[PDB]
Design brief:
The PDB classes it as structural protein. This is part of a larger assembly, with one copy of chain A, two copies of chain B, one copy of chain C, one copy of chain D, one copy of chain E and one copy of chain F. Chain B is built from 14 helices and 13 strands. By secondary structure, chain B is an alpha/beta fold. In chain B, helix 2 links the parallel strand 4 and strand 5. By secondary structure, chain C is an alpha+beta fold. Helices cover 20% and strands 12% of the residues of chain C. Chain C has a two-stranded antiparallel ribbon. In chain C, strand 1 and strand 2 form a beta hairpin. The longest helix of chain C has 10 residues. Chain C is flat. Chain E is rod-shaped, with a radius of gyration of 20 Å. By secondary structure, chain E is mainly alpha-helical. Chain E starts with 39 loop residues before the first helix and ends with a helix. Helices cover 10% and strands 0% of the residues of chain F. The longest helix of chain F has 4 residues. The chains are: A alpha/beta, B alpha/beta, C alpha+beta, D mainly alpha, E mainly alpha, F little secondary structure. Chains in contact: A-B, A-C, A-D, A-E, B-C, B-E, B-F, B-G, E-F, E-G. Chains A and B meet through helix 2, helix 7 and helix 11 of A and strand 9, helix 9, helix 11 and strand 12 of B. The structure holds guanosine-5'-triphosphate and guanosine-5'-diphosphate (2 copies).
């Protein structure tokens, strides 16, 4: 009665998916074959017993290009995912939102919505639809938009979170990313609920400084994103003190209509050696989530004001120590906070200590995950705009989009609404002087 | 599954693609006789990109082998990997190239293009989804220019939504193997521009410079010159043949590298290269890879990037490597060289990483660059064409095969109308 | 002026009305929509219900 | 010294975009808040 | 993933062409070419004595 | 004449079928050889 | 972590650097095959200053060997520690300077400096925090003067905030190996002034003085003369390379050793020096190191400091040793010899103590001295120049290479402009 359908879309997705579902498994026991090595019903949030003792993941990996999903159809977890829940296609989407929301994407939509319906007609109480994608890619920005919109047509006002890889603040692995990103935000600004954002450059540093990994790859990063999906869903899988469901993150975060881009930040992300010298206490873990060097989205939260921050304490966290910490962070005049939000600190205290994947990160008996909606994400939208404009000015790399189904004009309407978004962050910022 | 129809025209294209099939069958574990004997199951996962399956577990390369001289087909059939191609795919005609674009484009070349298209249609409708075509030729000379561009036009007309990569060997300034290289190149670039999607200009000057300065060979010859081109041929088409993190196939390189339809001329490069004396002094890492990729000694065209701003760059790495090094090194190149990159494309460098390296090597990387500096390659051909055309030199047989002065004038005008966009985008 | 010509080219162009193709299997098998019976195509004829 | 650029180049065509979030009460309240926005963002 | 994170990785890596006849080095691994004439000096000596004799 | 070509002859690009033994650089136009005109 | 790009100009500079690299390789425990064979883990702690790591635990020097003749590269490669350098940074030229500053600065130097700058840019790129550059050259002669100073100027253009340490073999009065060494020295001192950060004037005459009288050698060689230089090279850049108390690197020594932006000519000296017949009678302690260091017979330049005022003095001791004795054997000097020291800078002596001593020796020290007496060398070179310039001689093969007449005049003008601010401070 607490199931959560997960639609992983794109390399990033299929890849964060591998990481996410490995943690999911090691947590409930489900071995890389389904058969749980028991000789109880918590697994239902993500798994679905067949009766023969096989637990099948409740997910729909979708990628217009093979390769990524195919390495999952021939690997350790090749017997867990039901073949028809790993829906690949034939041709890619060349980092072109156009061929993801119009041409080579509107063909896989029918089947994916189909599978999503069967994984819904078996749920006794769906909580939402956690969609994982990358703002910067064909399937990531294209299929998600189409999928999100078509979902809204069906599942109407049903929750639909969006863990995403926000464009980088300097690195970037594409030359057309800026475009796809602005186009995506536009088609999902009104169709998505609370889209969480994790920048890669950030995790890269958090892994070189806090997790002692000099040369981090996508897997080190992916596995940390899995710990975040755990805390966000921990309450509806393990017992705690202040449970937090997946319908409250839309209410206790998204303030006004458009604004819906919370940012992620994890706690006790230490590294063995540097854990033999740390009391990882509720306070330490919390103060850390508000340090402008851990925010997993390079966006110095100091150059902006907090709008709503929901903390999620997973582990041995005395309820009193939580109230104490939030108090201390409030006093600190460095951390700011808008006036229209006296109470801006939400708290969820579960009990299951963070799970240790045989790989990296320390065994902590306490850890928090903050999800604030800082107005300091405005810098990011401005940087994305500088980029979109530096190119749209010479209608560069637009032939490809008009070369699929995106009428030139759409590019304008998109950036124009992204400018509206920026003007919104200005209003939600200014404090009534009355 | 996606697949690529390979085409090779002229002596140059035939020999380069022969070395290419040698390289890629070495990668995929295919023996000379066509069967498979390798070591990994990740080699037959995507073998249906270049090899059609036959009876008895045999893999026949999908390639159309076109030439107008009936000796280059014989040499390809008798080469190292000669008993691997289809005998039907050896399409030819007992005639002469005569290193003549008119004789390759309006003559017995046009009398052979129908049989060539029949073979191409066989290999293109023996498919389920075809990514596109990969033609290898030389612009300077016959066949590869004439048959090559005529095949380019008819294949583009028949299949209008498939990617198309042409590896063109373009004439060289200091030495010329044929006299009428500027005529053939001027007549061929006009067909290259408004037909193809990815054109790779490989110059013999840069090939010999890699042979001398980087590799320090004693007697470099055409086997090694085509080996260096097969380098980038293998490097570009690796994400759709072997698994990786952040894959990028032909169309996903073309989208990120072709900002406008006229600009698709690239400068390839492959850079785990070192001499046998400097081999034991190496420190093979991703920063060393970027160091060898971004210098103007490994790039395989005779065009200096110091004379033009980089429009787009793509780096297709091949090896087990950290993505942090790759992202930070591709940022560091852009930051340390600011005036060599255009400002209106922010972060104009694309990254792809495949896991499986080339066999026998820990780690490789291929470079592709669309730059302003493709100026000089078309310009020198334009002044040489103007010099040889003002005095009507070597032209009576060009008009004897059925051409006109206005087609030559249009070819020169379209060479200049390719030069001016890459003039203006090099100056904001 | 090639900037203005390319800008006019991308401004003044209609795109495709692209061809409808649907994929049925997990692998990616494409099938055309009109020729298959999974579309109303021959309902809207001129001889429907009349000789 | 490490000088800073002005505001990043945005389109002069897209600097005239109207609002999509009427979070405030009456209009004079809005400009009187934005006067403090100008003056407090002015340093010291 | 300690292989791409090991401080002692360069002390256990090998050069691409450790010897003149390495079994790893093939056509795909581009560290062994055909124009590098090992037989250059012996070929010149053979040619010179041929010239002499003829 | 002992040349670099005659050493590397069965690996060179532009060498036809070596059916005889003395020179690998003979000419073996037997594969091309259109089927009506062939013995 | 810091790095030092080491560059070598001329035959003399190449031999000096060869002995320097033998000394550093012995000091860090690196065998001629390039790998590590040592006794302590402190050798590998800061080995990433002069060496970069390669495959198989092989450390390669970050040295650029530069010469205009392909005859010194062969000797360095055939030397004992010859198979340790990269084969690529042996930058030679198929020409000859012929003992000519004009042919070092305004001729074939101008296009060989581009290749050297490419190599130096690669070596500086492979360094996260480069401390600077270390050029070894001879002022009197070709290559080292002209190309050396041109390289110094262009490296100053490329990297402004990095220390430039220049070991310069200033020509001697007593014996001459080149007739035109006054012209070369006069043209090189100006570019040493209006560029570098620290210049160490080593003199062949004083090297012979040390090797004949102190070491009591019978037949000294250039190997011994270079050994004396390499000793003070290691003694100067040992605090940044080995741990110790009161460390001092190149920038610290420059800060405490130059009072004024031009006065960066120094007088090195390394003196725990014993004869083989006097080693068993040595009582090596802290006052003996200081007195042999400060005696005016172990200097490495023919500039007798008792004729001038010590503007500033720095000393880098090496070993496990006592700090009152450190401070007291320098306070004793400062108070006992008061007229040889300037009065406007009290306590004008800098102390560094490296802990790890030179191997085979218990305890050592090196010396750097900025003094009024260095003006003796410049008056001597100026008098040689004004003896040879008034007759307009040895000059056609300076003006025919691209120079002008007046260039020598402003070289002499700045050469005597050095005459003022190291005589005014010697006479307050
Ligand atoms: N953690 C993680 N992030 C990834 C991974 N792959 C890509 N990303 C991020 O996502 C961005 C692009 O990924 P995607 O949008 O998913 O790529 P795609 O949609 O599959 O498009 P193509 O594979 O190029 O056809 C990159 O800029 C990366 O920052 C991954 O495997 N793991
Ligand atoms: N890379 C490479 N280039 C070649 C080879 N053989 C010939 N070429 C080039 O091909 C050019 C001439 O070929 P061409 O006359 O067009 O041959 P044709 O097309 O059969 O007429 C010359 O300039 C050569 O540089 C080869 O084996 N490899
Ligand atoms: N210390 C030292 N000095 C040397 C050595 N070899 C040459 N010199 C000096 O170099 C001077 C001549 O070298 P030079 O002509 O300038 O060589 P160039 O720079 O290549 O032109 C002589 O006066 C020597 O004193 C050496 O091995 N050690």
């Amino acid at each position: 009665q607490r199931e959560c359908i997960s639609v992983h879309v794109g390399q990033a997705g299929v890849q964060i998916g591998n990481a996410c579902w490995e943690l999911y498994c090691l947590e409930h026991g489900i071995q890389p074959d389904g058969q749980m090595p028991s000789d109880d019903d918590s697994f239902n949030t993500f798994f679905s017993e067949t009766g023969a003792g096989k637990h099948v993941p409740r997910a729909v990996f979708v990628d217009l290009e093979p390769t990524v999903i195919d390495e999952v159809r021939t690997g350790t977890y090749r017997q867990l995912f039901h073949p028809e829940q790993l829906i690949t296609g034939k041709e890619d989407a060349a980092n072109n939102y156009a061929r993801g929301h119009y041409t080579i994407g509107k063909e896989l939509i029918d089947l994916v919505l189909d599978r999503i319906r069967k994984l819904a007609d078996q749920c006794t109480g769906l909580q939402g639809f956690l969609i994982f994608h990358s703002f910067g890619g064909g399937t990531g920005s294209g299929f998600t938009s189409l999928l999100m919109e078509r979902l809204s047509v069906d599942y109407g006002k049903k929750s639909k979170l969006e863990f995403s890889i926000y464009p980088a603040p300097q690195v970037s692995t594409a030359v057309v990313e800026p475009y796809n990103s602005i186009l995506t935000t536009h088609t999902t600004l009104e169709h998505s609920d609370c889209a969480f954002m994790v920048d890669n450059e950030a995790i890269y540093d958090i892994c070189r400084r806090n997790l002692d990994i000099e040369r981090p790859t996508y897997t080190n990063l992916n596995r940390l994103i899995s710990q975040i999906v755990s805390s966000i869903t921990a309450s509806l899988r393990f017992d705690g003190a202040l449970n937090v469901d997946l319908t409250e993150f839309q209410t206790n975060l998204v303030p006004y209509p458009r604004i819906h881009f919370p940012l992620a930040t994890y706690a006790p992300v230490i590294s063995a050696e540097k854990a033999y010298h740390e009391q990882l206490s509720v306070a330490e873990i919390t103060n850390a989530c508000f340090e402008p060097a851990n925010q997993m989205v390079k966006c110095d939260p100091r150059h902006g004001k907090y709008m709503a921050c929901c903390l999620l304490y997973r582990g041995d966290v005395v309820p009193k120590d939580v109230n104490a910490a939030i108090a201390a962070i409030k006093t600190k005049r460095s951390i700011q906070f808008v006036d229209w939000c006296p109470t801006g600190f939400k708290v969820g205290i579960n009990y299951q200590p963070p799970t240790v994947v045989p790989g990296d990160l320390a065994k902590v008996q306490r850890a928090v995950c903050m999800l604030s909606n800082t107005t300091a994400i405005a810098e990011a939208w401005a940087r994305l705009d500088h980029k979109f404009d530096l190119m749209y000015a010479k209608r560069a790399f637009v032939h490809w989009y008009v070369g699929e189904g995106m009428e030139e004009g759409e590019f304008s309407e998109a950036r124009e609404d992204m400018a509206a978004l920026e003007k919104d962050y200005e209003e939600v910022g200014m404090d009534s002087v009355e | 599954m996606r697949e690529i129809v390979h085409l090779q025209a002229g002596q140059c294209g035939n020999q380069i693609g022969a070395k290419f099939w040698e390289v890629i069958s070495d990668e995929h574990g295919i023996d000379p006789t066509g069967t498979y004997h390798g070591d990994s199951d990740l080699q037959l996962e995507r073998i249906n990109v270049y090899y059609n399956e036959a009876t008895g577990g045999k893999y026949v390369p999908r390639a159309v082998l076109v030439d107008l001289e009936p000796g280059t087909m014989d040499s390809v059939r008798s080469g190292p990997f000669g008993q691997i191609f289809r005998p039907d795919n050896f399409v030819f005609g007992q005639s002469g190239a005569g290193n003549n674009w008119a004789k390759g484009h309006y003559t017995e070349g046009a009398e052979l293009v129908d049989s060539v298209l029949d073979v191409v249609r066989k290999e293109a409708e023996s498919c389920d989804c075809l990514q596109g075509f990969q033609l290898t030729h030389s612009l300077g000379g016959g066949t590869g220019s004439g048959m090559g561009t005529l095949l380019i036009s008819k294949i583009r007309e028949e299949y209008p939504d498939r990617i198309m990569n042409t590896f063109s060997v373009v004439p060289s300034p200091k030495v010329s193997d044929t006299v009428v290289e500027p005529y053939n190149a001027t007549l061929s670039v006009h067909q290259l521009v408004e037909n193809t999607d990815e054109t790779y200009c490989i110059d013999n000057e840069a090939l010999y410079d890699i042979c001398f300065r980087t590799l320090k060979l004693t007697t470099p010859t055409y086997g090694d010159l085509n080996h260096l081109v097969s380098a980038t041929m293998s490097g570009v088409t690796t994400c759709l043949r072997f698994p990786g993190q952040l894959n990028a196939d032909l169309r996903k390189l073309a989208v990120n590298m072709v900002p406008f339809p006229r600009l698709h001329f690239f400068m390839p490069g492959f850079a785990p290269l070192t001499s046998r004396g400097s081999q034991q002094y190496r420190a093979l890492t991703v920063p060393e890879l970027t160091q060898q990729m971004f210098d103007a000694k490994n790039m395989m065209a005779a065009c200096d990037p110091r004379h033009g701003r980089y429009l787009t760059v793509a780096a297709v790495f091949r090896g087990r490597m950290s993505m942090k090094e790759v992202d930070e090194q591709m940022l560091n190149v852009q930051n340390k060289n600011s005036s060599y990159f255009v400002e209106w494309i922010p972060n104009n460098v694309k990254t792809a990483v495949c896991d499986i390296p080339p066999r026998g090597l820990k780690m490789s990387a291929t470079f592709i660059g669309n730059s302003t500096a493709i100026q000089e390659l078309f310009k020198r051909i334009s002044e040489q064409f103007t010099a040889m055309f003002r005095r009507k030199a070597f032209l009576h047989w060009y008009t004897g095969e059925g051409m006109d002065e206005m087609e030559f004038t249009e070819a020169e005008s379209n060479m200049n109308d390719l030069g001016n966009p890459v003039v203006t985008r090099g100056a904001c | 002026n090639f900037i203005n010509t390319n800008a006019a080219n991308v401004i003044m162009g209609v795109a495709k009305k692209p061809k409808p193709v649907y994929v049925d299997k997990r692998t990616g098998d494409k099938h055309d929509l009109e020729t298959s019976g999974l579309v109303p195509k021959y309902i809207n004829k001129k001889d429907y219900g009349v000789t | 010294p490490p000088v800073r650029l002005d505001a990043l180049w945005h389109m002069p065509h897209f600097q005239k975009v109207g609002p999509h979030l009427d979070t405030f009460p009456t209009e004079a309240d809005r400009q009187r808040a934005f006067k403090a926005h100008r003056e407090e963002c002015a340093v010291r | 993933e300690f292989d791409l994170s090991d401080p002692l990785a360069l002390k256990k890596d090998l050069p691409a062409r450790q010897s003149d006849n390495d079994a790893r080095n093939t056509v795909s691994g581009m560290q062994k070419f055909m124009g590098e004439d090992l037989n250059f000096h012996q070929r010149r000596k053979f040619q010179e004595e041929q010239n002499r004799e003829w | 004449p002992e040349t670099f070509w005659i050493q590397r002859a069965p690996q060179l690009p532009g060498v036809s079928n070596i059916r005889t033994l003395d020179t690998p650089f003979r000419k073996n136009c037997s594969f091309s050889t259109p089927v009506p005109l062939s013995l």
